[PDB]
Design a protein around this ligand. Structure first.
Ligand code: MG
Ligand code: MG
Ligand code: MG
Ligand code: MG
Ligand code: MG
Ligand code: MG
Ligand code: MG
Ligand code: MG
Ligand code: MG
Ligand code: MG
Ligand code: MG
Ligand code: MG
Ligand code: MG
Ligand code: MG
Ligand code: MG
Ligand code: MG
Ligand code: MG
Ligand code: MG
Ligand code: MG
Ligand code: MG
Ligand code: MG
Ligand code: MG
Ligand code: MG
Ligand code: MG
Ligand code: MG
Ligand code: MG
Ligand code: MG
Ligand code: MG
Ligand code: MG
Ligand code: MG
Ligand code: MG
Ligand code: MG
Ligand code: MG
Ligand code: MG
Ligand code: MG
Ligand code: MG
Ligand code: MG
Ligand code: MG
Ligand code: MG
Ligand code: MG
Ligand code: MG
Ligand code: MG
Ligand code: MG
Ligand code: MG
Ligand code: MG
Ligand code: MG
Ligand code: MG
Ligand code: MG
Ligand code: MG
Ligand code: MG
Ligand code: MG
Ligand code: MG
Lengths: 141, 148, 183, 123, 52
RNA sequence: GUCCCACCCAUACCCCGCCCUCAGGGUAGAAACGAUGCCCUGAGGAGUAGGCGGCCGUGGAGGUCAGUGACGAAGCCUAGG
RNA sequence: AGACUAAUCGAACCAUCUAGUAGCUGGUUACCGCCGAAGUUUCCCUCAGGAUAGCAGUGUCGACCUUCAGUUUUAUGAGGU
RNA sequence: CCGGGACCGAGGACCGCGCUCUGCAAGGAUGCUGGCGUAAUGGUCACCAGCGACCCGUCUUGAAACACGGACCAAGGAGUCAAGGUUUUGCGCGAGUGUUUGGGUGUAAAACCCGCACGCGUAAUGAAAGUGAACGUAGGUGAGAGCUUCGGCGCAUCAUCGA
RNA sequence: AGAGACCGAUAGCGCACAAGUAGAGUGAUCGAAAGAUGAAAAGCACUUUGAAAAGAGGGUUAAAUAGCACGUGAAAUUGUUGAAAGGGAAGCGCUUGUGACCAGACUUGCGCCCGGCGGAUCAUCCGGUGUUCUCACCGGUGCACUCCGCCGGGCUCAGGCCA
């Protein structure tokens, strides 16, 4: 055939609508891109098998590409929400990524993304008051 | 496009790549083909031997149509037959019929004899024919006939 | 100081294709892997020829293939990293298996009609990853109109740059003894 | 805290000021390579301004790194700052100058949630 | 005014480009990478009954 | 004038770090990669005229960022980063 | 008196041909990286200029072939300082 | 074989050469401890100090020149475009190739479609009349990448003798 | 009459304005500069000082440092204020010092034990869906020698600057 993951990467390597390039780095805002980096490894929209993790209301929501529905986008994503426990979510995501050979190279990235989202969903601590060093004398008067 | 040109790279460099001693003046050496038998003679003799002088006789009011006689070789003679019929002849499904080729209809006037011919009879109608082409057609078993 | 005649000398050969063809890039990746992971010099030669410009990949005709198919080469697979064209002068196309960068429509049709086989270079890599039983062919590099003009000079019999051909165009004084001298 | 990294070395802190820009107001201080035939700076006379060279290039490990060890990433909204979710130890968000105050507050709140350092958070 | 405003393109190359664009239009990743919202599209070469 | 000892320092020499250039290798039954990437090793760096490469900036056009903005765009000033 | 002919006269003023031609003078606009000269040959109403070869850059290609060398050695010629 | 001093610590799981072999000074710094946790370190600016430092551009063998231009500032300001040619890139098709003079059509200067002729190429040579390209598996010799059944087959290209 | 990958008030026609105008020349001819308050003049009533121009109050406005010298308002150049240096130039490079003024970093985070508080899944099993067909999700069960979170104490590890 004329179309493959390598061909799609060849045609989308230099520019695509998900690319965000600037000094100090080039990122990708693709939904199926763990680490949000621009590379064949993580450009999930070009690969037949890919994973994406987004925040849920209380846990994480994981989408995986279904290989048989690559031409049917409305039914091309297998979605599952994990809102029980951080460790159970990690276990399920790691199984999803490695047990059946579905992008085993993305296991660490997917677990780290789930951990980062769950950490962000925690309450934030208030910032300590900011001290003054040169403004202290001028504002003390 | 202007952004790919070397003038953009010469910005900030005085003399724009034309040198400081030689300065890109207007026309040193003259315009066009000035000095062909002089300062430019070295070039006009190294390249273009035969630039100067006359050779041969004149033809007032030359009408190019008088000399129209495009030529085709016998090696491409069989390419004038349609591909299916040509394949039938080459494989041998006829051997009782001969193809008659109208070179003038195909746009040719003279038949030349560069290539080889398969041993298949073929009638060729041509205004002109070379001796070798005629001999080769006859040996292949056909004939050439003059048609004007 | 180190007193060197040459410093920072760059390699004079191509290291990648100047083309932006995506399929050519994929083919180059495939043959880079093959040339790295195999001992066959065939793979390295094919990889280097995949970088080459079009004038460095002159076309090969069916008649040129037929010439080299003789003398014990009939069952070898013909490999041409170039375009394979047809030849009207060849009336009978021999049965042949050819892997080429591309084929013209007539060349492909005649090869298939003669009982032969047409392959791409990735198919060739699949069936013969080491290039075994292959016949690697190149087209005529110098058979080009521009080359006829190269190196023009006295007593070199090259083609001059003229706007037209005729008695009035570069044929007098420098080309015959009746007009001073000949070349 | 940023990722462990080798100490940051600059090799130079001065700006490579243009020749005679200190004497002529028509000359901006931005560096220009002197092309003059007699130019002492071009000929590298002792005691003159230095010309920039590739030898001054910073270490590849610490290039584009602010003293805290982070690389600046310019963000214009919350969705932009969310791109740094997996990079809170290597990248710090810098809010664009033309961002409104409410959007700045939203970006700062989201960056606090994500643990991403903001270089220009105070306002 | 006699600047070369228009560009002559081979018809064969025009037809290749058109065919290549048509082929690319059938690849779902390419639509998203070009910025189309096709997450709810039932099938990438989306065909609607001509009776509609 | 001759002979001897110690010492001073060049952008030279030696050792080390870093930048770039050039060169030579590794990297897929892919747990895979801005393969235009990464990893390993060696050497080299003056330059007018001039050549080539890569990049920065400006006016306008197509696509895209579901981009920024009267809760303040652009511009301008700034011994603040 | 080459004087005067509207402050203009060894050929007035105005507009146009006209952006007249100049081998001559002046100028010719961001950065970094790599390479890097010549003022010599032959011809030219040639001598403040050209073409021509040389020196230079870039792009390649060829098996980069086991050859190449501003060097020494050995053997063997020439020269008239 | 013993001291005394200086500068430096690149790399980052293991892998290797090894030794004085439960370990080691053997393919690159660790261990212990103290003060401070802020303008203390550090950066920027102004000034003093030590050493260094001629005015740029240009022509030129040679410029800081008693060589020329430059009082200062803002804005403007100089290798463009067309035709023709050439070589080298990238493309499409390929013994062919080129739709767009024109016609058809159109959501109307776009896009799409069509073909007769024509240009270039497919044959050269001679002033011209004119003639016009295979003895050979399209030749022999020496090389020649790559294949090889290991006996040779020999691309491109070069030199050479032939047709 | 319709358009533009055109120009945008030193540009674009010489002319975006009472521009072929003002002005110059006997004349033929030559020939400029010059756009922008504000949404709306609401274009500053009134008091006071002054001969007046104006100033100071006051008023209009979202805004008067938008006041017909009117959007923004650069540089050259100038005034005041503050700091500093200066024995026939100054500027500048390397390097400290002083003074002034500052950006960061830090003020924690990980784990492991011992108590307190809260919750209901924590394993397992059953059923239904999904899926990469063995990995999950959703319901039912669980029901406190589980699981999760928040406080309090102790310990461990890492983490800033100068030594
Ligand atoms: Mg230069
Ligand atoms: Mg000049
Ligand atoms: Mg000269
Ligand atoms: Mg010249
Ligand atoms: Mg050196
Ligand atoms: Mg001779
Ligand atoms: Mg005679
Ligand atoms: Mg004569
Ligand atoms: Mg700096
Ligand atoms: Mg000089
Ligand atoms: Mg070095
Ligand atoms: Mg250099
Ligand atoms: Mg413009
Ligand atoms: Mg603003
Ligand atoms: Mg007289
Ligand atoms: Mg008069
Ligand atoms: Mg008079
Ligand atoms: Mg007169
Ligand atoms: Mg006049
Ligand atoms: Mg050099
Ligand atoms: Mg003469
Ligand atoms: Mg001169
Ligand atoms: Mg003598
Ligand atoms: Mg003598
Ligand atoms: Mg300090
Ligand atoms: Mg000083
Ligand atoms: Mg001095
Ligand atoms: Mg002189
Ligand atoms: Mg000078
Ligand atoms: Mg003097
Ligand atoms: Mg002079
Ligand atoms: Mg002069
Ligand atoms: Mg002057
Ligand atoms: Mg302007
Ligand atoms: Mg300007
Ligand atoms: Mg041209
Ligand atoms: Mg034709
Ligand atoms: Mg003829
Ligand atoms: Mg061999
Ligand atoms: Mg105007
Ligand atoms: Mg004006
Ligand atoms: Mg005007
Ligand atoms: Mg008048
Ligand atoms: Mg105004
Ligand atoms: Mg007011
Ligand atoms: Mg104001
Ligand atoms: Mg205002
Ligand atoms: Mg104003
Ligand atoms: Mg000022
Ligand atoms: Mg001085
Ligand atoms: Mg200091
Ligand atoms: Mg359950």
């Amino acid at each position: 055939s004329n179309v493959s993951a390598d061909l799609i990467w060849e045609v989308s390597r230099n520019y695509n609508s998900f690319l965000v390039k600037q000094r100090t780095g080039t990122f990708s805002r693709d939904a199926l891109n763990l680490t949000n980096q621009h590379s064949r490894k993580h450009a999930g929209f070009v690969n037949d098998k890919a994973l994406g993790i987004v925040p849920a209301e209380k846990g994480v929501k994981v989408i995986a590409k279904k290989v048989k529905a690559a031409n049917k986008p409305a039914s091309s994503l297998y979605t599952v929400t994990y809102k029980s426990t951080a460790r159970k979510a990690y276990k399920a995501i790691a199984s999803q990524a490695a047990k059946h050979g579905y992008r085993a190279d993305l296991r660490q990235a997917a677990v780290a993304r789930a951990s980062a989202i769950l950490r962000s969903q925690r309450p934030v601590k208030p910032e300590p008051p900011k001290k003054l060093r040169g403004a202290a004398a001028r504002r003390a008067a | 496009p202007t952004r790919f040109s070397k003038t953009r790279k010469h910005r900030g460099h005085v003399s724009a790549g034309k040198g400081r001693v030689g300065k890109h003046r207007k026309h040193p050496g003259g315009r066009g083909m000035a000095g062909g038998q002089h300062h430019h003679r070295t070039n006009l003799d190294k390249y273009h031997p035969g630039y100067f002088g006359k050779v041969g006789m004149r033809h007032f009011h030359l009408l190019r149509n008088h000399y129209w006689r495009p030529s085709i070789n016998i090696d491409k003679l069989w390419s004038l037959v349609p591909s299916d019929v040509r394949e039938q002849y080459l494989s041998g499904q006829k051997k009782d019929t001969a193809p008659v080729i109208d070179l003038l209809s195909h746009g040719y006037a003279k038949l030349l004899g560069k290539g080889r011919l398969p041993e298949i009879p073929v009638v060729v109608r041509a205004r002109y024919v070379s001796a070798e082409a005629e001999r080769k057609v006859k040996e292949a078993g056909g004939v050439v006939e003059l048609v004007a | 100081g180190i007193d060197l005649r040459w410093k920072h000398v760059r390699s004079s050969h191509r290291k990648a294709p100047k083309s932006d063809n995506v399929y050519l890039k994929l083919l180059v990746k495939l043959y880079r892997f093959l040339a790295r992971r195999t001992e066959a010099p065939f793979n390295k030669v094919v990889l280097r020829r995949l970088f080459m410009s079009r004038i460095n990949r002159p076309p090969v005709s069916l008649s040129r293939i037929a010439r080299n198919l003789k003398n014990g080469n009939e069952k070898k697979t013909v490999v041409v990293v170039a375009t394979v064209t047809d030849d009207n002068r060849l009336l009978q196309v021999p049965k042949m298996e050819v892997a080429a960068l591309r084929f013209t429509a007539k060349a492909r049709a005649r090869i298939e009609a003669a009982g032969g086989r047409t392959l791409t270079l990735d198919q060739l890599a699949l069936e013969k990853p080491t290039g075994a039983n292959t016949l690697l062919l190149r087209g005529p590099k110098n058979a080009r109109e521009a080359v006829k003009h190269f190196g023009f000079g006295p007593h070199k019999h090259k083609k001059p740059y003229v706007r037209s051909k005729g008695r009035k165009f570069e044929r007098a004084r420098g080309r015959r003894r009746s007009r001073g001298f000949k070349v | 805290a940023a990722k462990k990294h080798v100490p940051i070395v600059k090799k130079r802190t001065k700006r490579f000021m243009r020749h005679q820009s200190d004497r002529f107001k028509c000359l901006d201080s931005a560096w220009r390579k002197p092309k003059g035939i007699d130019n002492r700076v071009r000929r590298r006379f002792k005691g003159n301004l230095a010309m920039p060279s590739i030898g001054y290039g910073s270490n590849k490990k610490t290039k584009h790194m602010m003293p805290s060890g982070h690389k600046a990433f310019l963000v214009h909204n919350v969705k932009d700052v969310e791109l740094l979710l997996m990079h809170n130890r290597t990248y710090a968000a810098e809010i664009a100058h033309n961002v409104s105050s409410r959007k700045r507050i939203d970006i700062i709140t989201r960056a606090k949630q994500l643990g991403v350092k903001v270089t220009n958070a105070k306002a | 005014i006699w600047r070369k405003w228009h560009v002559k393109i081979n018809q064969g190359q025009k037809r290749f480009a058109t065919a290549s664009a048509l082929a690319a239009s059938a690849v779902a990743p390419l639509l998203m990478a070009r910025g189309h919202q096709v997450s709810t599209v039932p099938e990438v070469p989306l065909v609607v009954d001509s009776a509609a």
